[PDB]
Coordinates of N, CA and C in Angstrom, one line a residue:
Chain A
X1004 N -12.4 -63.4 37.5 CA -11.0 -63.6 38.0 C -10.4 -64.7 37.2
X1005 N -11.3 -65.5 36.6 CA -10.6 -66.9 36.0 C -10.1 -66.4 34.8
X1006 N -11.1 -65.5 34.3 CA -10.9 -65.1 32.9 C -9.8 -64.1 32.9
X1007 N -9.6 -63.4 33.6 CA -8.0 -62.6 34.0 C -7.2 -63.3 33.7
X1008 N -7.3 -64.6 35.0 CA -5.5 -65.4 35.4 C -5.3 -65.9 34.3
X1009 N -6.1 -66.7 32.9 CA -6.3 -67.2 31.8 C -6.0 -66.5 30.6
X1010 N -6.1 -64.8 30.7 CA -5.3 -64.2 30.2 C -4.0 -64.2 30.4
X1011 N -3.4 -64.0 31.2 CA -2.5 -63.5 31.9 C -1.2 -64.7 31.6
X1012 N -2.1 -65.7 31.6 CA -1.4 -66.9 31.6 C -0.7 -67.6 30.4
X1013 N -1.9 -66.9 29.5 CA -1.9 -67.4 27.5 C -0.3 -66.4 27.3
X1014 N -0.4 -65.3 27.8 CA 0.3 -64.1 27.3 C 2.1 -64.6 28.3
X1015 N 1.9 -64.9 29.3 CA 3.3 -65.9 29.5 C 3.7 -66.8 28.3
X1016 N 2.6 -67.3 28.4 CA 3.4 -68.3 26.6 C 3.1 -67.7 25.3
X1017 N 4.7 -66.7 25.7 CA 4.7 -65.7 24.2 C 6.2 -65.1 25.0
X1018 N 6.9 -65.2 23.9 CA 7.6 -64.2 23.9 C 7.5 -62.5 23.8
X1019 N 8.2 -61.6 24.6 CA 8.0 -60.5 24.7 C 9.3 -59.9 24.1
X1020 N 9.1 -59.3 23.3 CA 10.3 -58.6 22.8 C 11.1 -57.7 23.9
X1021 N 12.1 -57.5 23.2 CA 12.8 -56.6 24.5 C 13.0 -55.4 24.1
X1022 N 12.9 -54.6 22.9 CA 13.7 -53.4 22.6 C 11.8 -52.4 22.3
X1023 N 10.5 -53.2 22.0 CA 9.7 -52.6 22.6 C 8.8 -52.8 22.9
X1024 N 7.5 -51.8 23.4 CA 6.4 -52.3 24.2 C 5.4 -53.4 23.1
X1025 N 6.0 -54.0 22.2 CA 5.1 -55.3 21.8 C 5.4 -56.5 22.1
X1026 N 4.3 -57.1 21.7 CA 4.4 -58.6 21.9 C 4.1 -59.5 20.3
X1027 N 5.0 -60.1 20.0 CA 4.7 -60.9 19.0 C 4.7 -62.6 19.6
X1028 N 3.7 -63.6 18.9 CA 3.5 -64.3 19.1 C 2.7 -65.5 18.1
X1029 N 3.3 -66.8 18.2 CA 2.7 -67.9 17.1 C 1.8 -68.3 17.3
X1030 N 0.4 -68.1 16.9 CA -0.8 -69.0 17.1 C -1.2 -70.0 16.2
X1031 N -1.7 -71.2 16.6 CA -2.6 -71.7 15.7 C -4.2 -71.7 15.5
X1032 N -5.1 -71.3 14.3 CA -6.0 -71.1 14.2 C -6.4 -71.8 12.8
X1033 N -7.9 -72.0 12.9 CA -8.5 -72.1 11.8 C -8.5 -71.4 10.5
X1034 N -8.6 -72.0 9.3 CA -8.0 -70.7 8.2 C -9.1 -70.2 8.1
X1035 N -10.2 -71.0 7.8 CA -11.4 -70.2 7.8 C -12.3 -69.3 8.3
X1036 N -11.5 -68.9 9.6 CA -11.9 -68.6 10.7 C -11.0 -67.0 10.9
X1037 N -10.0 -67.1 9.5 CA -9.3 -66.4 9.9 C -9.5 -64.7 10.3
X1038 N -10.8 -64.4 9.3 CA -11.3 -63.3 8.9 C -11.7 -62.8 10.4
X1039 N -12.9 -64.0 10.7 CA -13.2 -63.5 11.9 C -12.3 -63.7 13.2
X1040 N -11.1 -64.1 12.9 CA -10.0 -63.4 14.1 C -10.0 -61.8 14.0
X1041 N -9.4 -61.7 12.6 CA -8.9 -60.3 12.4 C -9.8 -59.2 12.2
X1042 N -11.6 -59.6 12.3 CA -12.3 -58.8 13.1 C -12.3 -58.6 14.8
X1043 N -12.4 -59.8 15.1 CA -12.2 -59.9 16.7 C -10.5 -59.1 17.3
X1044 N -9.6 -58.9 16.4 CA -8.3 -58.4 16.6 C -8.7 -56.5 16.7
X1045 N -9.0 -56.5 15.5 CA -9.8 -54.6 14.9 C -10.8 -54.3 16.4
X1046 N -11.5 -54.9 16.9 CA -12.7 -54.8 17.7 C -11.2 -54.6 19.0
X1047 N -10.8 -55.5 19.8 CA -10.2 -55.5 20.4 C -9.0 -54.6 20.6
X1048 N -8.5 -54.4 19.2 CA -7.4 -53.0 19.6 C -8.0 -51.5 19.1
X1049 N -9.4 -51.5 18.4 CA -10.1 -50.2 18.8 C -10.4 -50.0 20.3
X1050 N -10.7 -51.0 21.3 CA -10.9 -50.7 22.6 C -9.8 -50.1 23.2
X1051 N -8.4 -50.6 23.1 CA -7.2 -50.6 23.4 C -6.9 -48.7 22.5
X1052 N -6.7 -48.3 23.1 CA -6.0 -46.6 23.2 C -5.4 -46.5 22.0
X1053 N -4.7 -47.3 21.8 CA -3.3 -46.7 20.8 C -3.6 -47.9 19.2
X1054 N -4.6 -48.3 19.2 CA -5.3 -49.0 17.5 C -3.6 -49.4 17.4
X1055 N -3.3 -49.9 17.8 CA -2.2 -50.9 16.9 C -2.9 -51.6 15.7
X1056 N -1.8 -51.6 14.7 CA -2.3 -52.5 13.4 C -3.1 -53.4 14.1
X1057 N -2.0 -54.3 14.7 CA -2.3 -55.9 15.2 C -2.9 -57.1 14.4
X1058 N -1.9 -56.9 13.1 CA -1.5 -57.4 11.8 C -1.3 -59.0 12.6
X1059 N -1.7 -60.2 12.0 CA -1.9 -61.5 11.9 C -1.4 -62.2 10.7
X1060 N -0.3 -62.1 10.8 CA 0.4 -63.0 9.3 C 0.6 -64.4 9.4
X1061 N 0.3 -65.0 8.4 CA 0.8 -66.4 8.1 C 2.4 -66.7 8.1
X1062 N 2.6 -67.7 8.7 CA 3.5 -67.9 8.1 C 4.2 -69.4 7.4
X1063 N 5.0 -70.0 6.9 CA 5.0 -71.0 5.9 C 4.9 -72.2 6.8
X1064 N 3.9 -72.8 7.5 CA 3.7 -73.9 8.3 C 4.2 -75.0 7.8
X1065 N 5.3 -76.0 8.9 CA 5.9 -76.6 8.6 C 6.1 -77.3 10.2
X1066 N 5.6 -77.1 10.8 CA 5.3 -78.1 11.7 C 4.0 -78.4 11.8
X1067 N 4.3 -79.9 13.1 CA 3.0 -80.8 12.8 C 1.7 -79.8 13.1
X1068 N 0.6 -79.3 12.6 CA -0.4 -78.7 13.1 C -1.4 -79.5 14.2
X1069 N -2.2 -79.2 14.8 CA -3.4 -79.8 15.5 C -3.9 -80.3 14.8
X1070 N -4.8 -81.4 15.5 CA -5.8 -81.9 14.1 C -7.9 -81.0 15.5
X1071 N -8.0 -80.3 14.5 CA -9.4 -79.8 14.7 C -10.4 -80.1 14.0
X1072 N -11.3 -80.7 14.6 CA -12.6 -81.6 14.0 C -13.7 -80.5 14.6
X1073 N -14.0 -79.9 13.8 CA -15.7 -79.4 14.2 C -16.8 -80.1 15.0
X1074 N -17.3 -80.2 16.3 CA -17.8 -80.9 17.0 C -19.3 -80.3 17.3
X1075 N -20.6 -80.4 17.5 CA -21.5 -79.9 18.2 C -22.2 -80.7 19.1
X1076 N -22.9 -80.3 19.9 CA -23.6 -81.2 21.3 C -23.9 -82.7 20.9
X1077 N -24.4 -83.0 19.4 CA -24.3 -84.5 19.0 C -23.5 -85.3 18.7
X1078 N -22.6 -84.3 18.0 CA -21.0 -85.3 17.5 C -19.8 -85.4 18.3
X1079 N -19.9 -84.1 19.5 CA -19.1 -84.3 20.1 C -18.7 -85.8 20.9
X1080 N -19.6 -86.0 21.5 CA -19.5 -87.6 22.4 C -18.8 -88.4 20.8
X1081 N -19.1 -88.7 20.1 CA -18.6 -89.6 19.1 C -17.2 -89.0 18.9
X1082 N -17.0 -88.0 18.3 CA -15.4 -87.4 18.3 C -14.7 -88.3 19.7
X1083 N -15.2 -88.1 21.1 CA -14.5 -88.1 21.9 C -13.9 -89.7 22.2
X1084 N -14.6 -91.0 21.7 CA -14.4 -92.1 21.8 C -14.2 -92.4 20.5
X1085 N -13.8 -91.7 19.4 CA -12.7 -92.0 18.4 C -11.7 -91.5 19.1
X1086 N -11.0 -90.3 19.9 CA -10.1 -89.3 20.4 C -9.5 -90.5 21.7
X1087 N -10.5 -90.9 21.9 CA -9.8 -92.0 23.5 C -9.0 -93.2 22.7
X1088 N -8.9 -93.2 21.3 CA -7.9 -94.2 20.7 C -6.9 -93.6 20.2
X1089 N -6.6 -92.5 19.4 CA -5.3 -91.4 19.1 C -6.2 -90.5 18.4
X1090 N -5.4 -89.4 18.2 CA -5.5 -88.2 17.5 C -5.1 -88.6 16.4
X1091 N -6.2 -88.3 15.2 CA -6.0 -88.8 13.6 C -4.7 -87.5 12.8
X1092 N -3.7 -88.3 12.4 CA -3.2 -87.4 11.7 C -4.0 -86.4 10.6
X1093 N -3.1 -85.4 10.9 CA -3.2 -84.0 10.1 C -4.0 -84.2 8.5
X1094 N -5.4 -83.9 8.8 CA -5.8 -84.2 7.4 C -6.3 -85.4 7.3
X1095 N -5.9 -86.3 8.6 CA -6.7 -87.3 8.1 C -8.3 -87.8 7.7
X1096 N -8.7 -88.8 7.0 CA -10.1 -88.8 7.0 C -11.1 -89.1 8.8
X1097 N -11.4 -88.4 8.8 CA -12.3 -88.5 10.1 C -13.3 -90.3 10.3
X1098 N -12.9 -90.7 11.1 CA -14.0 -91.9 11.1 C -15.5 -91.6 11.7
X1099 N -15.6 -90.1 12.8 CA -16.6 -90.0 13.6 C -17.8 -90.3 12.3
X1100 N -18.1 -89.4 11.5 CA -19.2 -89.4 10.8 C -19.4 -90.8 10.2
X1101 N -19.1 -91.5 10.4 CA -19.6 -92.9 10.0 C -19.3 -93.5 11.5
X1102 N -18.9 -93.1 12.4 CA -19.1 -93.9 14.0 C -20.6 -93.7 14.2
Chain B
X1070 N 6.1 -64.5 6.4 CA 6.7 -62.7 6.7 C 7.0 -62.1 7.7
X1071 N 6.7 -63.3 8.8 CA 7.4 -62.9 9.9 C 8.6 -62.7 10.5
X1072 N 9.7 -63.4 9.7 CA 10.9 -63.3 9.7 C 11.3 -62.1 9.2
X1073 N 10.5 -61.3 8.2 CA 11.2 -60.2 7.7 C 10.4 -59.1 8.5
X1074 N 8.8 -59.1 9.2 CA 8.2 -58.2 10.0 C 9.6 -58.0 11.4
X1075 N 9.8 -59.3 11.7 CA 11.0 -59.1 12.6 C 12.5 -58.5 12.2
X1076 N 12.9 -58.7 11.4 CA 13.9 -57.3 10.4 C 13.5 -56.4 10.7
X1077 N 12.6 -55.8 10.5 CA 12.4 -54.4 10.4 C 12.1 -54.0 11.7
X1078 N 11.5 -54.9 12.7 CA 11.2 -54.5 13.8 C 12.6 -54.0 14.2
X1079 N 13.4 -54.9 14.2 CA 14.5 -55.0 15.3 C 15.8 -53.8 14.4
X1080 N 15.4 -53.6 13.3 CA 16.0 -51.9 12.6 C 15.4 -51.0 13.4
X1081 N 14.0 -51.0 13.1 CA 13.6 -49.8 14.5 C 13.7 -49.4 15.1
X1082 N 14.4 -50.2 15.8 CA 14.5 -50.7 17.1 C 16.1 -50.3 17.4
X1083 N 16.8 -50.6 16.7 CA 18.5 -49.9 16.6 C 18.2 -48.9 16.6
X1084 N 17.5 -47.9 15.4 CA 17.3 -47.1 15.1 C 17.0 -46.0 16.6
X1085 N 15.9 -46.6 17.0 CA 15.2 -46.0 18.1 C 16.2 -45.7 19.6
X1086 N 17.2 -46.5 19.4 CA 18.3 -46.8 20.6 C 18.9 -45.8 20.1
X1087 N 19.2 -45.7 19.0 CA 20.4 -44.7 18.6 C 20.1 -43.2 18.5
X1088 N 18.8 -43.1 18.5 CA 18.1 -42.1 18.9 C 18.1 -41.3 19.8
X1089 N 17.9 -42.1 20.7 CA 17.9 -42.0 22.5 C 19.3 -41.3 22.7
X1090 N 20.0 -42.5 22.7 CA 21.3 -42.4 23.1 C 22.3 -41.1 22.4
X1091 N 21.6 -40.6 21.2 CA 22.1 -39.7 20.6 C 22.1 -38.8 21.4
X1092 N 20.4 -38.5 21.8 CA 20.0 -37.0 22.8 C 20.7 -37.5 24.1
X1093 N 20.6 -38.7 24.5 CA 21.8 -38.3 25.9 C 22.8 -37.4 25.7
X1094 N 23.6 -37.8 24.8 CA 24.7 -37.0 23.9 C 24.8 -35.7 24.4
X1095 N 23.6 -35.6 23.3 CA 23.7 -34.1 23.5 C 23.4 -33.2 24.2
X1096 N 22.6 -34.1 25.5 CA 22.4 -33.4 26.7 C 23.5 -33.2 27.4
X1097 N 24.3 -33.8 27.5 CA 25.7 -33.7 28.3 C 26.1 -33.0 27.6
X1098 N 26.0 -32.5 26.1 CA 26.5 -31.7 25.3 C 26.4 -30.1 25.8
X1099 N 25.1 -30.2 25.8 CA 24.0 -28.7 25.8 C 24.7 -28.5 27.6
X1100 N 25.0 -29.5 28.7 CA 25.1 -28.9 29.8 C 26.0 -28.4 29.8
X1101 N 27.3 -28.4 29.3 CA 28.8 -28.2 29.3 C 28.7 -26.9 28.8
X1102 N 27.5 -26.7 27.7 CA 28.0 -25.3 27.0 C 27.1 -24.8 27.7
X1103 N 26.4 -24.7 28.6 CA 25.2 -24.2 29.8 C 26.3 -23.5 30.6
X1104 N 27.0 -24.5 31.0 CA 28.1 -23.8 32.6 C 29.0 -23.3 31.8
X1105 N 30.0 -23.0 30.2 CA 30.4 -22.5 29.7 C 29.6 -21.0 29.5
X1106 N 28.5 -20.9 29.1 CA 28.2 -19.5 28.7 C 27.7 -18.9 29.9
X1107 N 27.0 -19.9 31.1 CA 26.8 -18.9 32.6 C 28.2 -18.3 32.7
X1108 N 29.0 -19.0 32.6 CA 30.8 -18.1 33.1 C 30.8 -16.9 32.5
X1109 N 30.8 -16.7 31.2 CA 30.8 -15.7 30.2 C 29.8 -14.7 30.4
X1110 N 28.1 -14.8 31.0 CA 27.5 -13.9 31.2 C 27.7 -13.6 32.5
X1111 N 28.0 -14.4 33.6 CA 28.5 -13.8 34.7 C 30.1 -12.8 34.8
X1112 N 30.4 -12.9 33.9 CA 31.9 -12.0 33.2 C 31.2 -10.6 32.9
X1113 N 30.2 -11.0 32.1 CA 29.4 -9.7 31.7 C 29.0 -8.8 33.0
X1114 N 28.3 -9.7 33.9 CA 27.7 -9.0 34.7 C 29.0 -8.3 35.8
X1115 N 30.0 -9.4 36.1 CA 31.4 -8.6 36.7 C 31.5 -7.2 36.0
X1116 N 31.9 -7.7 34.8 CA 33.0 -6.3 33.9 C 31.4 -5.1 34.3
X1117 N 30.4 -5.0 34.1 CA 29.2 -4.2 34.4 C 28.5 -4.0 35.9
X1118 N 29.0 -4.6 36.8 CA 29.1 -3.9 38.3 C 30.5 -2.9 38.4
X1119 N 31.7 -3.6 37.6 CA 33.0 -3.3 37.9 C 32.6 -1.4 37.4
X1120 N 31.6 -1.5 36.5 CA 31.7 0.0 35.5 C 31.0 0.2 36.6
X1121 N 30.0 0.2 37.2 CA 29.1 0.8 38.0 C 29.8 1.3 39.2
X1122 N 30.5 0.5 40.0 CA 31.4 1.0 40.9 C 32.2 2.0 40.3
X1123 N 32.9 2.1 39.3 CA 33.9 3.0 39.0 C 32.9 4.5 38.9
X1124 N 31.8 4.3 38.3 CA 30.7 5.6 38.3 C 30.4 5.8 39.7
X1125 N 30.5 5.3 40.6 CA 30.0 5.5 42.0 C 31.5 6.4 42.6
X1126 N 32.5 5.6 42.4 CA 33.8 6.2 43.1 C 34.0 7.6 42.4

């Protein structure tokens, strides 16, 4: 049920077109990562009846992005008490690995 | 490219309206000449009782 309302919820924050049954919408993601969205996209609208493309385009980013730091069970805690002083800008050099 | 994916959607999308709205058209079209030619075969069917009676008299 959480995983439903959590759907349901993502897809409110998106505009829905009006003239037809799609939804277009701006995400941010990993570039690297990108391939394996647009597997996870193919996988997901083969389930879905009607294979929409469900085509994932770039577009010329120009606002501020997230800053995403790769974290695992050991670096995480350290990421997080660099994070309880600001979020390093875009690109910045990371201090965790030398915290 | 999403500015221009959106172009084309939203042509489609006129496109697809105008489509519709066409065949409404022509549905109101097609009814008018529906109750137009029922008149005309029921004429037929008059003027061909009318002959049938006259064979009977």
């Amino acid at each position: 049920v959480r995983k439903m309302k959590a759907i349901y919820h993502t897809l409110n924050l998106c505009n829905i077109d009006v003239t037809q049954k799609c939804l277009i919408a701006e995400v941010w993601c990993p570039v690297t990562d990108l391939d394996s969205i647009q597997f996870a996209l193919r996988r997901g609208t083969e389930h879905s009846g009607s294979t929409v493309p469900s085509i994932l385009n770039r577009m010329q980013t120009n606002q501020t992005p997230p800053t995403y730091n790769k974290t695992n069970k050991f670096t995480h805690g350290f990421q997080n008490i660099v994070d309880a002083y600001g979020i390093g800008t875009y690109r910045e050099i990371n201090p965790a690995p030398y915290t | 490219s999403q500015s221009q994916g959106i172009q084309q959607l939203l042509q489609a999308e006129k496109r697809a309206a105008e489509k519709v709205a066409d065949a409404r058209k022509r549905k109101a079209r097609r009814l008018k000449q529906a109750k137009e030619e029922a008149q005309m075969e029921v004429e037929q069917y008059r003027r061909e009782r009318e002959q049938e009676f006259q064979s009977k008299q």
